[model samples]
Target: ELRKLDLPREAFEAASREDFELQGYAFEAAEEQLRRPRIVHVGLVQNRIPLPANAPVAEQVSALHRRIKAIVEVAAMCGVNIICFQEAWTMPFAFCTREKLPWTEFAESAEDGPTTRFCQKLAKNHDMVVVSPILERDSEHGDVLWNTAVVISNSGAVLGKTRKNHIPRMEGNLGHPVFQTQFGRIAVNICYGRHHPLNWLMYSINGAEIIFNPSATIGALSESLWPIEARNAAIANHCFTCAINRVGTEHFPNEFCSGYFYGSSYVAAPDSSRTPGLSRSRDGLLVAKLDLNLCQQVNDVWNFKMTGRYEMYARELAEAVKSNYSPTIVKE
Candidate 1:
């Protein structure tokens, strides 16, 4: 189902010594005399909350921050140009509980949140673009909350924030947005958004070369579909997909408890190939080396985009959205 990647022995040795799960793989493109390779090292971090779900907000955030920093150090050592953390990496996945007080308290300002500041430091120190997903509280905009992915440039500047277009808890306000990071053009497909093909398609249409689907899902609910969706997007869009999911179950002080979050984070290449998934039960970092040129390479062979009839879909969708819409039901 997955392919093994040959990485230097030192990388594994470093993981063993640092006490974190680590995996690495690379996807190459055909060399051309005209264009030099555009190789970029990407890292996906999947982890559990180091503190209890009911722990003090600051303590919980700080604990996970420490753990993530350690893993990120390893990624930087391996020359990762960009790194992404699992969904809501600073807080527990408590939205399923449906309570607003304590859970909503975890939301913070996306522009200057403690989590974003921490990630900025990492990105700056390591010269790596960081995609940090968090529950955001927009104080300026009526204090409304959002599921957001904050992209920090390698220089530590807050490039921009992309709100999750598809939301399970709150109505997402932001449209599909792509981040033009220092390394590549990327986008975020938050949890539940992965189920929609159109969500993934829009990212590609918006000129995203790499898309990160950072999610927190239970084994019973999404294990079967988790592996297929991102890989399928990679093949169809002729882009790379990095899927990151947290591990371990989190129990709250109330009657709510999160089922096991199986972390099998991996990177899927444009040519229908993918790296082996990380541990389903452990905290880990998955590093993938990608040549952005592969996007054009895959498109050249398939010609899916070139042959796509946008006008036809536009006409059909336009008609379907009207009040007097009729299905094109065929009778035998």
Candidate 2:
């Protein structure tokens, strides 16, 4: 549902038209100056894992492949240049219960894994960048597996990999159910980590232009609950944020997870002026054209990065971290 605002549909449409016209004019200017690259933002549905929690790992992989193929095909049909899949797209998120055995088979090699290979082929065919998240089986580090996302270029080249940082322990008897880590410059805060703003700030400081908060959270902890946090992070960091999520109810026979996914996968632009709004409850793809230059424009206009007194606050923040100072007690 769209929030009620004073602006009328015609006014927004007119603004969009003007933006397109300006973009066209800017494109001509840039073309005259030199070749300009165009980047498109593509958000995918990537519905819930259909396999049972107790299903064999092989069966789970097969089901995941089918789901991925369907998503790729749908994305191609919709003319998506770059696609972002939901979190841990290759397997059901059973990590919420301290499941150890599943991890053994769930993790796959990032360089040569079946999912990575499949994505490479798709990216090459479509000329698109595919952001795929999986349980990464490290080839160089023995059996150590990490929650990682591989960024594949349109030419099928591996841009790099980013592991989720800021793993969180949910509140309940689950006892530190969720976990995540980070790799490279991009930051990934998985399901529970979305609640932590510092995790996002770290990524922003590390030069993450586009942050993806792909997740499988459902019910009250659904995308709706945490989408705003990512948007706020985007605003504060002056970066583009895309929230990709899984839809559909995952029933494990006797255990029915009574929850609705609240499909609201969207893209928050750096300017905070363009939002894809939200998606429907069912399976679908939400697409938006992103101007990467918009981030620089917003940063230049806002000057949050330049004016923020980091030198003065660094010592205090460091002391706060050392003393484990709670914000409730600290007065600025």
Candidate 3:
């Protein structure tokens, strides 16, 4: 069973009244004499698009902004230090159609775009760190587009951005980088990257304590695999991993439509403990408090960090990357 965090009645009721399901959980470690508990409150927001897919782009974006703002405000009231939204929170999952005309228009700059500005204000007002994943229109690189996550600091500054290293069927130029936030060191695995064990390993190797996997995967294709992936990463990396997926089936202007996006967001801890899944069919917020000290404590207990044979793997990986390399297959 997962541990639950008690929420203030007022804050709980406030979000409940807004029709957003709210749940709280906690992860802890034994107290040490030398170091104090590094308790930080984290939140995950899973939501359906505010308007129909055929709605005007501006109207869709604005409506989502309103809906997310209301949810994040309640998160602030619950004293969440950091919060992350579902993948491409501002727009519908239009990539399913592979149409570039109208859907491409929804992509915005990862820097000072409307979505970034909106999140910056919320981060500033609530003193929270916001991890926003969006479809990025990178004009600096000749209007190339990518799936990216923009991290805004508690002080309302754009800390840095990380592009999705592994697109579902699509560098990953941003590389695997972790954001050093005021509360904790974090990274985002982004959508399909969850399936690649190496992707999760890179984040852990890069010094990430908490990694967020924001995805728009549907129930039919990925619901069964969802629970295991992030939890496995936490156990393997000795870090906390939060898995967030969007809710509802989205229909496009075309004849085809995406499958139902199962909203079973949850947090997995380094010690193999995790929170229960959030609502499957409704929009919801999951708040959890974690002791950052647990990362090192678990690492110390498991000794995976000390025992990992990085030198051998490094040499093997280096050789494997060569174009003329051949595998050392022992076909006895």
Candidate 4:
């Protein structure tokens, strides 16, 4: 609903020779920036790709490129300086099926994959920073695999990548690292790590002005918790958080069950204000104009950073980690 009201980017870009044609899909980009202030315009895009497991691997990638290219064009025209896609936006969410053929086949090198190449084009053309989350296969490193996000600078240069931590099933790279961009310092907390408060706090500790959590979640698993967690992180940490989730239903080839992705991807501010998300069952974009300075404004008033008893808690936490020193829940 927010995206339909007014879209002004097309008109501005129409006069330019760079107005390339779009794919068959008509996209949406909502701008409420007039009512808000802006030092940065952030875009969150969640896609619902049709399952094409039967098709050739290259063909599947081609289809995803079409949609992603179209979305970036719209975002760039709208003057979105920073954008993020949902986890594995280049392909369907196939992890739940636990199948090896199609899911593993979709994994590509994070630094130089087709997806990164596609995004690099738009990032350079529009001078926009892009956060792309994908399934990464580290071929040179003993064929290891991980869930990773590649952060691209506005210059179309690959800054670095961050592998997800806190994956209960697989070994992951821990610690939070922030990327310094022209807009501000940014970081990523991928899908599974959103549930961990410590995962969020670490980014804040690293001076991240904006932390993007590129996620893919289902209704049955965590629909209720979805909205709560990001808002909590924003308010608690005094920074901006952009949360993107995959949408629509996905079907596997075998006897795997169907999963519905609810797509209410949103952006939360330090004062706990948020933009209402995109539709629950469509591929859409949410654009927000964020006053980056508001982070310090809210933080100063709250004073949680100054007053919080960090030294006291640090000692207790160290003791809690000691051998055979578990504290009882109901100590008499």
**Candidate 1 TM-score, C-alpha based:** 0.93
Best by TM-score: 3
Best by lDDT: 3
TM-score of every candidate: 0.93, 0.73, 0.94, 0.85
Order of quality (lDDT): 3, 1, 4, 2
Give the per-residue lDDT of model 4 (tens digit) for 63-108.
Answer: 8787777777787767789989888877766545233666678888
Worst 10 residues of 2 by lDDT: 20-29
Give the per-residue lDDT digits (tens) of candidate 1, residues 47-85: 888887879988998898888888888888788999999
Could you tell which candidate, 1 or 4, scores higher by TM-score? 1
TM-score, cand. 3 vs. native: 0.94
Model 3, 235-312: lDDT tens digits are: 998899999999988746435433578899999999899999998889999999989888767766686767889889
lDDT of 2: 0.60
In candidate 3, which residue pairs get closer than 3 Å at backbone N, Cα or C atoms, i.e. clash? none
- Score each candidate by Cα lDDT: 0.85, 0.60, 0.88, 0.76
The 10-residue segment with the lowest total lDDT in model 4: 21-30
User: Which sections of candidate 3 miss by over 4 Å?
Assistant: 31-34, 95-99, 253-258
Residue-wise lDDT of candidate 2 within 1-332, one digit each (tens)? 22222323443354344221001101011233233334554545546666776789888888877666655554555456677778888776643433245666778888878888888888888777788888886678666667777777778877767666646541311112111112112334555556677666666666666667777666674444655787787788776677766666653432322244555676666665444434445555555555555665565468676876778678778877876576636456
